[PDB]
Design an enzyme around this catalytic site. Structure first.
Site, PDB file in Angstrom:
ATOM      1  N   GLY A  33      42.700  53.422  63.525  1.00 38.79           N
ATOM      2  CA  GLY A  33      42.903  53.851  62.143  1.00 38.79           C
ATOM      3  C   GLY A  33      41.940  54.934  61.697  1.00 38.79           C
ATOM      4  N   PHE A  85      38.998  55.278  60.534  1.00 38.88           N
ATOM      5  CA  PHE A  85      37.586  54.825  60.496  1.00 38.88           C
ATOM      6  C   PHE A  85      37.102  54.444  61.910  1.00 38.88           C
ATOM      7  CE2 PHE A  85      35.831  55.540  56.613  1.00 38.88           C
ATOM      8  CZ  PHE A  85      35.345  54.486  55.828  1.00 38.88           C
ATOM      9  N   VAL A  90      38.525  53.141  66.342  1.00 37.43           N
ATOM     10  CA  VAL A  90      39.500  52.581  67.284  1.00 37.43           C
ATOM     11  C   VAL A  90      39.152  51.110  67.588  1.00 37.43           C
ATOM     12  CG1 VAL A  90      40.859  53.051  69.409  1.00 37.43           C
ATOM     13  CG2 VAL A  90      39.669  54.930  68.278  1.00 37.43           C
ATOM     14  N   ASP A 102      42.579  48.223  49.193  1.00 38.21           N
ATOM     15  CA  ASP A 102      43.452  48.769  50.223  1.00 38.21           C
ATOM     16  C   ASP A 102      44.354  47.684  50.778  1.00 38.21           C
ATOM     17  OD1 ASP A 102      44.515  50.937  51.633  1.00 38.21           O
ATOM     18  OD2 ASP A 102      43.047  50.821  53.275  1.00 38.21           O
ATOM     19  N   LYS A 157      47.644  46.342  51.874  1.00 43.22           N
ATOM     20  CA  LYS A 157      48.887  46.910  52.404  1.00 43.22           C
ATOM     21  C   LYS A 157      49.234  46.114  53.639  1.00 43.22           C
ATOM     22  CE  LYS A 157      46.467  50.591  54.953  1.00 43.22           C
ATOM     23  NZ  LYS A 157      46.101  52.031  55.070  1.00 43.22           N
ATOM     24  N   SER A 158      50.454  46.267  54.182  1.00 44.02           N
ATOM     25  CA  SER A 158      50.872  45.472  55.334  1.00 44.02           C
ATOM     26  C   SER A 158      50.115  45.778  56.640  1.00 44.02           C
ATOM     27  CB  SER A 158      52.387  45.512  55.552  1.00 44.02           C
ATOM     28  OG  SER A 158      52.866  46.835  55.620  1.00 44.02           O
TER      29      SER A 158
HETATM   30  N1  LIG Z   1      40.494  41.859  63.722  1.00 39.66           N
HETATM   31  C1  LIG Z   1      41.521  42.491  64.331  1.00 39.66           C
HETATM   32  N2  LIG Z   1      42.308  41.845  65.224  1.00 39.66           N
HETATM   33  C2  LIG Z   1      43.344  42.464  65.821  1.00 39.66           C
HETATM   34  N3  LIG Z   1      43.658  43.751  65.570  1.00 39.66           N
HETATM   35  C3  LIG Z   1      42.925  44.473  64.688  1.00 39.66           C
HETATM   36  C4  LIG Z   1      41.783  43.815  64.030  1.00 39.66           C
HETATM   37  N4  LIG Z   1      41.233  44.730  63.202  1.00 39.66           N
HETATM   38  C5  LIG Z   1      41.960  45.878  63.312  1.00 39.66           C
HETATM   39  N5  LIG Z   1      42.978  45.726  64.198  1.00 39.66           N
HETATM   40  C6  LIG Z   1      43.939  46.799  64.595  1.00 39.66           C
HETATM   41  O1  LIG Z   1      43.154  47.985  64.783  1.00 39.66           O
HETATM   42  C7  LIG Z   1      43.811  49.148  64.286  1.00 39.66           C
HETATM   43  C8  LIG Z   1      42.890  49.926  63.352  1.00 39.66           C
HETATM   44  O2  LIG Z   1      42.761  49.248  62.104  1.00 39.66           O
HETATM   45  P1  LIG Z   1      42.006  49.984  60.891  1.00 39.66           P
HETATM   46  O3  LIG Z   1      40.874  50.796  61.480  1.00 39.66           O
HETATM   47  O4  LIG Z   1      41.720  48.950  59.837  1.00 39.66           O
HETATM   48  O5  LIG Z   1      43.091  51.064  60.366  1.00 39.66           O
HETATM   49  P2  LIG Z   1      44.411  50.771  59.464  1.00 39.66           P
HETATM   50  O6  LIG Z   1      44.180  49.511  58.659  1.00 39.66           O
HETATM   51  O7  LIG Z   1      45.620  50.846  60.383  1.00 39.66           O
HETATM   52  N6  LIG Z   1      44.436  52.090  58.319  1.00 39.66           N
HETATM   53  P3  LIG Z   1      42.961  52.309  57.388  1.00 39.66           P
HETATM   54  O8  LIG Z   1      42.504  50.909  57.049  1.00 39.66           O
HETATM   55  O9  LIG Z   1      43.420  53.107  56.176  1.00 39.66           O
HETATM   56  O10 LIG Z   1      41.987  53.014  58.320  1.00 39.66           O
HETATM   57  C9  LIG Z   1      45.099  48.674  63.636  1.00 39.66           C
HETATM   58  O11 LIG Z   1      46.158  49.053  64.528  1.00 39.66           O
HETATM   59  C10 LIG Z   1      45.006  47.165  63.555  1.00 39.66           C
HETATM   60  O12 LIG Z   1      46.275  46.583  63.898  1.00 39.66           O
END
Ligand SMILES: Nc1ncnc2c1ncn2[C@@H]1O[C@H](COP(=O)(O)OP(=O)(O)NP(=O)(O)O)[C@@H](O)[C@H]1O
Length: 266
Positions: free
Chosen positions: A31, A33, A35, A123, A125-126
């Site tokens: 996302g 912030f 990987v 924030d 969201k789904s």
């Molecule tokens: N605790 C977790 N367990 C499993 N998957 C995770 C976990 N945290 C994050 N992810 C996955 O990691 C990826 C990055 O998440 P994140 O950095 O929060 O970005 P995002 O929520 O997709 N958008 P944003 O929050 O605006 O940066 C996403 O594809 C999530 O599905």
């Protein structure tokens, strides 16, 4: 509480930051912030990414648990995000209505815990609703989160398609979370993303008005990838969505109300 990690253990647990999808044999989600990689630590599959007092005060079954940092390590959520499961990403089975009701309930129980405790997620969201082995809803990503006491901010943050009008003007209030949740509930009902550029309308929240102007029924919008969705509980859920999406903040129900209505729906 929080296990302090060295970077070099993290590197090796994630098969040296193997950026390949796990579906192809690797460790990679990502996302705006960092990987997120799958780790194997002792026998604890974790999720490693690159606030903490928020995670330190806020433990709840519907909130992702922070385990540790170097930085951030999380309990790892096998079933990914609600967005990806609604999309049926990588060929996963569509979520049943029964299951979707439980997830909406769990997500509301999660936000309730946050509001009782005077936090604003900012924030909702789904993509920020993760699903464990059992498809329990885990609200995640508390990087934008703020303690509450309505104030304003010069640093406007969130995701456009889910944002309340007052959250887009710079106000900070749990009321915006309620609004964002309303958009999530619409995503759950229809299985459509909050924004699709090659769609009409591009913005899912715009269907409220198509429906209100009785040009369309919620029935027209119901996700067709379910066979267990009765008219009564779907309308019950839509009703709750509609209330959350009232364009005027003080008109929306609070999270305790949203919760009791979603329990009554079931
Ligand atoms: N605790 C977790 N367990 C499993 N998957 C995770 C976990 N945290 C994050 N992810 C996955 O990691 C990826 C990055 O998440 P994140 O950095 O929060 O970005 P995002 O929520 O997709 N958008 P944003 O929050 O605006 O940066 C996403 O594809 C999530 O599905």
């Amino acid at each position: 509480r929080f296990h302090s990690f060295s970077f070099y253990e993290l590197k090796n647990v994630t098969n040296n930051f193997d950026e390949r999808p796990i579906s192809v044999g690797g460790n990679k989600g990502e996302g705006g912030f960092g990987v997120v990689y799958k780790g194997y630590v002792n026998n604890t599959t974790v999720a490693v990414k690159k606030e903490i007092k928020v995670m330190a005060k806020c433990q709840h079954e519907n909130l992702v648990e922070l385990l540790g940092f170097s930085c951030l390590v999380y309990v790892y959520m096998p079933n990914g995000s609600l967005l990806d499961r609604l999309s049926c990403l990588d060929g996963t089975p569509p979520l049943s209505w029964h299951m979707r009701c439980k997830i909406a309930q769990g997500a509301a129980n999660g936000i309730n815990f946050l509001h009782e405790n005077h936090h604003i997620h900012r924030d909702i969201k789904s993509a920020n609703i993760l699903l464990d082995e059992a498809f329990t809803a885990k609200i995640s990503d508390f990087g934008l989160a703020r303690a509450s006491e309505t104030v304003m901010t010069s640093r406007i943050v969130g995701t456009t398609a889910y944002m309340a009008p007052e959250a887009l003007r710079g106000e900070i209030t749990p009321k915006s979370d309620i609004y964002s949740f309303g958009v999530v509930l619409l995503e759950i009902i229809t299985g459509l993303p909050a924004v699709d550029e090659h769609r009409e309308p591009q913005l899912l929240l715009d269907i409220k008005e198509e429906i209100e102007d009785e040009e369309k029924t919620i029935e027209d919008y119901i996700d067709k990838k379910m066979n267990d969705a009765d008219s009564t509980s779907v309308e019950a859920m839509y009703s709750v969505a509609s209330q959350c999406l009232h364009e005027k903040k003080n008109k929306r129900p609070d999270i305790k109300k949203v919760q009791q209505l979603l329990q009554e729906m079931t």
